[PDB]
Design a protein around this ligand. Structure first.
Ligand code: ANP
Ligand code: ANP
Ligand code: ANP
Ligand code: ANP
Ligand code: ANP
Ligand code: ANP
Ligand code: MN
Ligand code: MN
Ligand code: MN
Ligand code: MN
Ligand code: MN
Ligand code: MN
Lengths: 300, 300, 300, 300, 300, 300
């Protein structure tokens, strides 16, 4: 029994020592590798991630069907990074970025570096150069599916080529790199976090579709326990409904009381119906930050 | 004749003495090697296995087409093991575990160890370390097909490498290890049990598909006679329909009487139609356990 | 910090040195590759393009739904080129050119070279021949979608074939080539500029539809920052409402004052309502040119 | 400059040498491939065609809405051909030919070959047989839209099948073949001339509708510059108002003087109002022929 | 020239050999396929048909507006067939046959087979059965427009189904089948003769409307040159005015002399006014038959 | 010949075997399907029907202009049915039944079931329920034209819906159902008998209009040869003049002698003028029944 607990602890310890923390863990453990993170713009996803956001210096993959919200998510990551003064780059092979929508999400477009490479190889080489510079914090690649190999222009093999080198340089510079993928597997193994995202419904303000009910699953997580999920809405032209997540997480954590349709904080009603309570948190950011901080301290 | 019976018995005896019990047997013999087992969650499969479940300290392979039920089966093995206080590990290369579904099947997610290895070699080494610890009872690997060799990332040979060492350490610690495989052959020879599983139909509650008609064949069995089969349903979001198997096995064994569509036990009707009779056993677990125990004593 | 600025500058510099200027840039940078351009006939689009027009010696793609204005746009490019004495060619697979409308837009039909090829391959070969001649400045192909491969007559592969060779010869002769496409991806990668155009409304002179509200997005731009947009009207039988764009851009740039509905320049009213102010600029081209020149100097 | 003119000429020359004259041309050039033609019965259309009529040995397509005048046009082509002793065939899938109207247009019905095929394939095979005979000058098919494939009776693919073979044999025998089409694209590419025809108004002799104002556009022309247009009237029961076209073309070419409503030739009035002047030319065919010849020499 | 005549003859010959006589012909040729025919009751129509009547063993379609005379025509075909001892069938989906009117036209109602099918499919199957019996000479279907498909009761596709089989069996048994259609196209292609019939005026005996001026056009004719026309009257309660046609055809053929309003044959007046001359032929059938025979010999 | 008679007989036999007797027949044949019938109250109509009345278990349609006698006819059918002890139902959507007039015609109003449904669907469902009961012999629906679909209240489609089911249940219970229709076609195909009725004149007893001269045509008859007609009078407040029909039919059949205006039976005068002879038959019902029976035996 006890000696078995010690045997287990030693074994887990030796494994971790050889392959690194995160090479094995209990799915219910609170522990999370100590790493610099960048918020995803979604409170429930930062929590599902265990570390409070995406890890710096690591490779991350985000995949899902068309219109699932992959780009919105990455744009919110960029805005969050830029909010902290970090330098971001956008490697584009999709040719679909909407700067108007991006600014609405907080992205500083004027200072966003951008590249629209001729081939998959060129994209990967530009990524490595930015990684080795030690002067770029976040690199988003949209998308992997559009990274046509030079020969095919004039695939799976291309990715295995410079993936090992790219990972090494990203790690050394502490550069976060996100690959967006639309629904071979060199990315599957080199990524420290893989997110599965999809639209699971519509948000209706009466009878008009105004947003999407979204769900993200952390299918791979080398910094904290994997398989947790996040659910949130993406409002058209506005992005992730962060405050709506704050309303639910506040209640769940017993920081915000819910009596039927009326929500209240510290005794005073903040709104009838999830919609009004959300509007209230949004207009009172100072109190929202406190509640958010409280939730993070409780779940992270 | 008689001297021929004695000659046969001696020959079989010498063979067994040299290569172990299970190296040869009559397909119709009742005898089953005395071994600790872990239920598969399926009554007809535990019976098809001859020992009442999967053998501890041995390697087991479970293969079948996509959506055949391989994972559900392994998750039920884990839940059954955890129900007895055993420590389980999940080595994942598929990145598809659904903890919500897992808890529904009885899995204690919080205490399930999990690893998402970088390479096939790393997975195998983690397996060996957990085996040598003498502190892990069940290890599930999902899946073999996803165990990409390091070189291929930056196959058949990889498996033959540490398979002999892994088997030795598993045996010594009495650790059960299950390899899930999706449809070279080092696994084929080192495994003590190999299960072929597939979907042979759909379960309809009227006209809506609610489950899968499933069939498992024990193509290899070194603990008891091989080639027996098991048939059972896997209900969406619920797992193996254990009680439905109990209804049929109870009847077959003349413990439960069937008169047309009405089933009865000890004189009293328990339901009209296999569905209601199943519901009854499920709501009266204490009586179900007795009938289950009876069936096991009769067929094991 | 500073050393990080220098590290960034060096990295961007090395990238540019290896893959050419335009291989990476800040979306808010003023810099634009020094290149010969040809006006598109639209002031806001020439500005959105960053270089003041489409680049000579490069491949350009213009795509959009039916009736979005693709042809009108290309015809205005041709007229602008011919206004400077440049030799233009029209490779037609649509068989829909209206010379009456074309002359209205300024096109010199009599001197416009035209080809109506039998197959996609023949079209591409004619394009290459005109490119290699060093005697053709602008080549418009209408459209890509109508370039049926010979075999299919008696696709994606056809385009990848001679696209690399065509691009080389166009570059060497400094010949601008525009592919019109109606809504595989060899064009997507070889093009230096890709324009997304569509009708976003109707222009009504009371209650009669007289034009189309149009929007063009520069989804790909290898000569200056991509993703900018242009909005302008296309009047039936007249083409792009250049003067209407001049009214708005003049105001925006504080060159033309707007007080309610009355517009004025240098103190004197030029018209009440965007329509009259536009008419005034149109009848006073000499002053319009000055204002246009001013806007270009300010935004280019 | 000059060397650029020579470079252009050589390039155009090489293109023409490789793909044939007509593979590229200036829209304003006077040159027209030297080919045998058959008048369409319309003076402005024979001119719009550049060669003075439709080309022998080539495929021609004539399409337009219902009642646009497609059949009348083809019937006038047949009459013109028969006037020169040429053998004509009519492949019919519409079953609507009016011999009374046809004779009025000059068609020699008794000697017109006719076929009413069972399937699209049979029609095409009959066409090929007539082509290979070297004894048929003009073949009219009415219509393409009615050429139902055998299978569909007991489409796009059917046309691509024998279109290449038919074209070859027609060319070799110098047989003109016209496909009438009512508003896949194998015809679009194999045709040397494609005509778009439609009714753009009504002809009123007071308040009674007596004819149709018609417009034909040469959307494809491989024998001379494409995109020219023709406008003429089609009088009920009479066909194309040839003399009315002669009045306008004579004036335009300054062969016939117009002073208000009075027209005159060589000093003498021929009628007040376009209607009377037309009647005069019609009653004085010998002078009309001279004026017609003059116009052709001036515009062809 | 001559060799061209021989080339033409050979080509036409080969075509006829491959697709049958009637697959191509000169519209003015006297030749008519040698076939058994059944008079339509109209002398000018039997002549317009070229063979003297409708062809046995073939499918015929007769269409026209309501009250155009379609039924009267078919009833006269039946009477003519029955006059020769032929067995006739009437497949009815209109439910409007007037036996009193039918007997007046010569129809032997008592021996006319009749069917009033439940569905379009049933009608077609009954037709095939009667065809395959080799014991039915004429089948009239009234009408196609009323042949509602079974599914639609509890269309174009239905007709294409058994049309090929029906045609085969009709041909083999030499059974004439007529489809009446009121104003997809499987009938259009399988029919050997298609007749377009309509009312073009009224017959007045003073000021009272007593009949209809009728015109039939043979829009499709695979047994002789198509496109000929027939004009005759249909008197209320009497049917086709055969004798009135005989008066005109006799005159036209110079067998009957007309001097103003007086008609005469072989020197003797037979009546003043087309009406009396008709009455005379009708009361002197023996002489009428001779004149009729003469006309047929001259025009057939 | 003979073998052709046998071929015909076999073919007709096979047709009848496949689609039922009545699927084909000679219009002059005496044969009538053996079926239970209900007199229509009109002797000439029962004869025109071939079976002596309307068929039980089948659907019948009776249509005609307003005031043609449709209701009177159905009321006489009901009275005749009730005279034999049959249970009748009246489904009313017209709301115009006159019980006083009905009793005069022999209808037993007190025992007549009646329904005045809210919607067309409800009417049809009530009909089906009465049909499936096996306890209702005759159902009259007045009228189809008034069967407004539910949706239209808060048509052609409605009828096709339950017409097939209704027909099946009516047949199984041997229930006669009559649809009255006032002048889509699901009724047209499901009905076994369709009657066209209209007023063709007035009955004057001097100069006062006392009745209507009526004519019914059996346009559809699946139990015996169709297209026969019936003529009889409908006297105001009395119904069908049955005896007047008996006078004419008796004479026609040479059972009653007519010498000018005097009628006589078996030698003795029964009245001068059709009116008196009718009165005589009416006052001597016992002799009238014999004559009626005689006529039926002769014509049925
Ligand atoms: N320019 C925009 N303006 C307004 N709302 C936008 C815009 N772009 C995206 N959205 C919103 O973003 C939600 C998420 O879409 P998006 O993030 O672009 O999905 P995606 O999976 O990243 N893209 P793709 O691979 O092309 O389907 C949508 O359904 C829109 O409501
Ligand atoms: N998250 C889930 N929620 C509900 N039902 C599930 C879930 N996962 C699996 N099932 C059920 O499990 C049945 C068995 O599927 P599964 O056990 O995952 O097959 P598999 O062969 O193990 N997997 P794979 O190799 O990926 O096809 C399915 O058809 C589902 O009804
Ligand atoms: N011949 C013409 N005469 C007058 N106005 C024209 C003519 N051709 C085009 N236009 C105008 O051009 C606007 C732009 O149409 P167009 O430029 O032809 O779109 P497109 O996308 O290029 N063509 P397509 O692919 O065929 O739909 C129209 O809506 C018309 O108002
Ligand atoms: N039989 C005829 N008699 C008198 N005028 C005719 C006749 N046929 C055609 N026309 C005239 O021809 C003009 C041109 O019609 P037509 O040439 O038949 O057009 P279409 O496009 O060829 N036919 P379709 O495809 O059937 O609409 C008409 O509007 C008529 O004035
Ligand atoms: N029962 C009848 N009695 C007297 N004349 C009749 C009768 N039926 C038809 N006719 C005459 O037939 C001429 C031709 O009519 P008809 O032959 O029935 O045309 P239809 O096109 O066949 N029928 P439909 O489709 O119903 O319009 C009419 O105008 C009548 O003069
Ligand atoms: N209440 C009544 N009293 C006396 N005579 C009646 C009565 N109802 C009907 N009749 C007679 O019935 C003859 C036949 O009329 P009717 O049977 O009601 O025609 P209908 O076509 O059934 N009805 P509708 O659709 O309303 O016109 C009439 O002209 C009347 O002489
Ligand atoms: Mn995206
Ligand atoms: Mn699985
Ligand atoms: Mn266009
Ligand atoms: Mn036509
Ligand atoms: Mn008819
Ligand atoms: Mn009524």
């Amino acid at each position: 029994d006890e000696n078995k607990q010690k045997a287990l602890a030693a074994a887990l310890g030796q494994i971790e020592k050889q392959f690194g923390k995160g090479s094995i863990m209990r799915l219910g453990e609170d522990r999370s590798m100590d790493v610099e993170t960048i918020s995803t713009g979604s409170l429930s996803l930062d929590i599902a991630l265990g570390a409070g956001g995406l890890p710096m210096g690591r490779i991350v993959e985000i995949y899902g069907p068309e219109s699932s919200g992959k780009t919105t998510l990455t744009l919110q990551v960029i805005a969050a990074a830029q909010r902290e003064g970090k330098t971001c780059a956008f490697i584009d092979a999709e040719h679909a970025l909407d700067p108007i929508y991006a600014r609405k999400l907080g992205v500083d477009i004027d200072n966003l570096l951008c590249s629209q490479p001729d081939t998959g190889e060129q994209a990967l080489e530009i990524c490595d150069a930015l990684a080795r510079s030690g002067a770029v914090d976040v690199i988003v690649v949209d998308s992997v599916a559009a990274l046509t190999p030079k020969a095919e222009i004039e695939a799976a093999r291309m990715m295995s080529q410079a993936m090992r080198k790219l990972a090494g340089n990203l790690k050394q510079s502490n550069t976060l790199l996100i690959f967006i993928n639309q629904i071979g597997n060199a990315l599957k193994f080199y990524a420290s976090v893989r997110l599965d995202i999809r639209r699971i419904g519509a948000v209706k303000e009466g009878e008009n579709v105004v947003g999407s009910e979204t769900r993200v699953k952390v299918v791979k997580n080398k910094i904290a326990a994997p398989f947790k999920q996040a659910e949130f809405q993406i409002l058209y032209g506005e992005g992730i409904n962060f405050y709506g997540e704050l309303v639910d997480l506040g209640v769940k954590e017993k920081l915000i009381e819910k009596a039927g349709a009326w929500y209240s904080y510290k005794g005073e009603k903040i709104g009838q119906g999830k919609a009004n309570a959300t509007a209230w948190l949004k207009d009172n950011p100072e109190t929202a930050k406190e509640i958010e901080k409280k939730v993070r301290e409780l779940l992270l």
